[PDB]
Design a protein around this ligand. Structure first.
Ligand code: NFU
Ligand code: SF4
Ligand code: SF4
Ligand code: SF4
Ligand code: FES
Ligand SMILES: [Fe+3]
Lengths: 447, 298, 138
């Protein structure tokens, strides 16, 4: 007997789960398959390097900002140019605004329906419309957070989806004093709603704990995230890896990523299976984003976020390997980004006019790295003397949680399915809940 | 009114633009009956009796083709949702290489990739179709919402008109109408061609008259021209007007026509092809699959 | 077993007259070409040539007045800038530059037209069929 969950819903992209049983009727093979691929790495060859920040955002419509900036950075390295401070701040402001929208989007519109209705049969209730029908205040807040984040992206990036200001040597436009004032005034409400969101999560994760669903897909792995002097940072710093026990294994510059990360290929999925090269396919499994970043970080960069992180760390320890608590860490990050949007808007250099540095001679190698809302994002481009791309490599966030998602779904089935009858609609949804915990973006991950 | 959405060879950006209606999304969802939408709900199969269907993305794999055909049979009105569905979009650049070259890079020759036996995922995953194709090449499409992604207001305007029974009408003019940049009354004249990083562009003068390849002249209005207003040329993401089949071809025609028009009879006709080192990427970023020659012969 | 499919675009004042003069003089040339009449070569733009390849053209020919002799003064100068970019665009698309041929032929030059048709036919016949339509029909 062979069962298939397709398509996996309330996730970005094309994914599916297969569950096979042997002749006796016992659980046999459970796998997570990604059924999409566009081949951006190859078709970027022959393109203008300065046009990479125009093509990569099209890898994904949720985290397009992350790609725009990762490409911009790599491109700024291809040209031996160091961008001005005001440009670094505008880019980061766009990055934080984008993270608020992405985290709010996932928690409220993709994850919350399961956290609110974990044991329902009514499939039509498990969605933002069902949540809005009984708790409209929750969906209204999600929308207000998303709108605030996208507003920041639109103002600083030119477009709410697929921004265009991160150009070679910096930004194509400056933030005007009036624009800055309007955004800073709106920033306080984004922090309030982000704080409120953490509580909605506490309540809903308590409901998950009551149904013995907080340990679904559990397994221990390494964790990777960007840190700036050991402090949590989504825009700059070095990449840190902690082991399953919390010991710092590596700390390296994103440009040396090829010496630490490797991506395996399995025949049943268009999604690769990354691992730490030194440790291997099984001992080198690591996770990225939200909890993985909290785990590697010494502390948060903002004060309100730090308080919830402190409270979480004392209750669940370090490192926390619970897939379902990724939801919680996501809420702490939703708050830190909201706090950062305000912080950056309060920095007088944001409205500066020294937004661009003149491009220098072309160096045919450039690496761009940023922590996308779903994990470490690395864009690596190689070009000719003309600045035409000759080779590229993209290690995109969610690809690094594919091993976790494939192990996790197996572990849910091992916990709830012995025979095919056990695979009820609610049990099958438990498998998709483990997937959703990692906030996957399958278009992103495959590129 | 039973409405449904699906996504193919795109990026979800059109779906996110629909969500960028924000407070208005709830007003829309109270009027319509959403029966299938992978991103927002768990209804796995496309149900029968769908009045309106929004299909995002172009045709990239065998499964995209099956879904498109299925949605066409279940829906009364099919809408090519966004530039990918309508013209093919950015993934369409994959047409410059063979499907084997796209897959060999991603699963074999990328620097970080470790593939011992050298296999391409082929189990439980669909095969790629020969070339990326706009939705209209495989199924009959009734209407389309251009844009990468289409603006939220435009999506609402189109959906609203269909719920009312009215026929949706898209803007007809090219982008310079909406662009706030100043044009020379004497007409356009291009002296040299610059890559976007070359020089420092004037914020008031039309970028095309400044030597940058701006696609606004060959691109449909509606977006509000955020790119030229932000300091970068238009990349032609909304696609061509209703009177232009091949956007890239018309853009090249216009560009070649005005290049050195003030010295029309003596200007060297080889400066332009020698200057543009990536022609397809300069004129077919978002529309290669809908072009007369939508692939590269190998 | 296979004969090239060639489409032509000739201006009404010169090449179309040049082509007629070849006929008046019974100047035999291969029957692959089919000419489309336009008033000036300035009417010719990339989309007309790209549309022809899409339809299955093995070769595309364009004929206009000699540079400086355009009935409309400078129509051919614009077409000349358009065709040079088009040659390179075709190479980028995998279409041999040789599959496109542009020439300046006056109305009295029937012999030149005959020879241009002979030479172009041989060129395309040697290259074999352009496999674009077959690739698209998959
Ligand atoms: N967040 C995010 Fe992307 Ni749609 C993913 N996964 C990018 O780097
Ligand atoms: S048209 Fe643009 S935004 Fe929409 S699916 Fe395609 S790439 Fe994404
Ligand atoms: S900058 Fe672009 S859209 Fe604006 S007027 Fe010039 S060509 Fe038109
Ligand atoms: S200005 Fe051009 S590239 Fe920018 S959003 Fe409008 S159509 Fe797209
Ligand atoms: S009339 Fe023959 S080229 Fe203009
Ligand atoms: Fe990759």
């Amino acid at each position: 007997v062979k069962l298939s969950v397709e398509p996996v819903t309330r996730v970005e992209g094309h994914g599916k789960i297969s569950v096979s049983f042997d002749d006796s009727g016992n659980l046999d093979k459970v796998r997570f398959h990604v059924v999409e691929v566009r081949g951006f790495e190859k078709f970027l060859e022959g393109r203008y390097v300065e046009d990479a920040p125009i093509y990569t955002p099209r890898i994904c419509g949720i985290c397009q900002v992350a790609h725009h900036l990762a490409s911009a950075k790599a491109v700024d390295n291809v040209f031996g140019v160091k961008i001005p401070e005001t440009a670094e701040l505008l880019r980061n402001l766009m990055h934080q605004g984008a993270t608020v929208h992405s985290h709010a989007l996932h928690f409220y519109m993709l994850a919350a329906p399961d956290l609110m209705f974990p044991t329902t049969d009514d499939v039509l209730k498990r969605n933002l419309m069902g949540i809005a029908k009984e708790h409209p205040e929750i969906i209204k807040d999600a929308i207000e957070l998303r709108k605030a984040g996208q507003n920041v992206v639109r103002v600083v990036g030119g477009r709410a989806i697929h921004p265009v200001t991160a150009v070679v040597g910096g930004q194509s436009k400056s933030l005007k004093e009036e624009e800055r004032d309007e955004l800073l005034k709106l920033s306080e409400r984004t922090i309030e709603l982000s704080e409120k969101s953490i509580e909605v999560g506490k309540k809903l994760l308590e409901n998950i704990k009551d149904e013995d669903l907080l340990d679904i897909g559990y397994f221990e792995s390494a964790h990777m995230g960007m840190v700036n002097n050991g402090v949590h940072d989504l825009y700059d710093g070095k990449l840190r890896v902690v082991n399953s026990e919390g010991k710092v294994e590596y700390e390296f510059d994103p440009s040396e990523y090829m010496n630490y990360i490797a991506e395996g290929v399995k025949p049943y999925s268009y999604l690769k299976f990354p691992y730490l090269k030194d440790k291997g396919e099984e001992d080198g499994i690591y996770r990225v984003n939200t909890l993985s970043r909290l785990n590697v970080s010494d502390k948060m960069a903002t004060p309100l976020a730090q308080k919830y992180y402190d409270e979480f760390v004392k209750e669940f320890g370090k490192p926390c390997h619970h897939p379902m608590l990724f939801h919680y860490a996501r809420l702490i990050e939703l708050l830190s980004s909201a706090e950062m949007v305000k912080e950056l808007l309060e920095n007088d250099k944001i409205v500066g006019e020294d937004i661009r540095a003149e491009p220098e001679e072309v160096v045919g190698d450039g690496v761009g790295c940023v922590e996308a809302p779903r994990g470490t994002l690395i864009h690596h481009f190689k070009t000719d003397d003309d600045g035409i791309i000759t080779d590229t490599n993209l290690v995109v966030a969610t690809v690094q949680n594919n091993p976790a998602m494939d192990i996790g779904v197996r572990k849910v089935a091992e916990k709830y399915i012995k025979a095919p009858e056990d695979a009820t609609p609610q049990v099958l949804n438990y498998m998709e809940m483990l997937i959703r915990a990692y906030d996957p973006c399958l278009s992103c991950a495959t590129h | 009114v039973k409405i449904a959405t699906t996504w193919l060879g795109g990026c979800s950006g059109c779906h996110i633009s629909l969500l960028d209606l924000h407070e208005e999304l709830l007003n829309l969802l109270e009027n319509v009956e959403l029966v299938h939408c992978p991103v927002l709900m768990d209804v796995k199969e496309i149900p029968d009796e769908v009045e309106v269907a929004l299909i995002e993305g172009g045709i990239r794999n065998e499964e995209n083709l099956e879904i498109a055909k299925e949605m066409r049979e279940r829906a009364k009105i099919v809408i090519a949702f966004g530039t990918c569905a309508a013209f093919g979009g950015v993934p369409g650049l994959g047409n410059l290489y063979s499907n084997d070259e796209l897959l060999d890079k991603a699963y074999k020759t990328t620097i970080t990739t470790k593939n011992d036996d050298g296999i391409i995922p082929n189990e439980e995953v669909p095969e790629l179709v020969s070339r990326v194709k706009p939705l209209s090449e495989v199924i009959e499409v009734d209407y389309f919402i251009p844009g990468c992604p289409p603006n939220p207001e435009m999506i609402a305007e189109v959906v609203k008109a269909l719920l009312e029974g009215k026929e949706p009408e898209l803007p007809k003019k090219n982008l310079c109408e909406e662009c706030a940049r100043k044009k020379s009354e004497e007409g356009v004249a291009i002296e040299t061609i610059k890559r976007n990083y070359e020089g420092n562009p004037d914020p008031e003068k039309c970028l095309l008259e400044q030597g940058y390849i701006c696609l606004g002249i060959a691109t449909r209005e509606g977006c509000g021209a955020p790119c030229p207003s932000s300091g970068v040329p238009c990349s032609g993401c909304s696609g061509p007007t209703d009177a232009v089949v091949d956007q890239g071809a018309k853009m090249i025609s216009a560009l070649c026509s005005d290049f050195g028009i003030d010295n029309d009879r003596d200007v060297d006709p080889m400066i332009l092809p020698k200057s543009i080192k990536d022609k397809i990427g300069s004129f077919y970023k978002f529309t290669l699959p809908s072009a007369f020659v939508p692939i590269r012969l190998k | 077993e296979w004969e090239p499919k060639i489409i032509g675009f000739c201006c009404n004042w010169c090449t179309y007259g040049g082509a007629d003069t070849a006929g008046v003089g019974r100047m035999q040339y291969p029957p692959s070409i089919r000419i489309i009449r336009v008033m000036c070569s300035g009417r010719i733009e990339p989309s007309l040539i790209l549309k022809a390849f899409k339809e299955g053209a093995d070769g595309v020919f364009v004929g206009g007045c000699h540079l400086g002799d355009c009935h409309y003064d400078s129509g051919n100068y614009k077409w000349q800038r358009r065709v040079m970019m088009l040659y390179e665009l075709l190479e980028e698309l995998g279409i041999e530059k040789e599959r496109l041929n542009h020439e300046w032929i006056s109305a009295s030059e029937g012999e030149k037209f005959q020879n241009t048709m002979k030479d172009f036919y041989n060129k395309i016949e040697a290259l074999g069929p352009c496999k674009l339509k077959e690739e698209l029909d998959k």
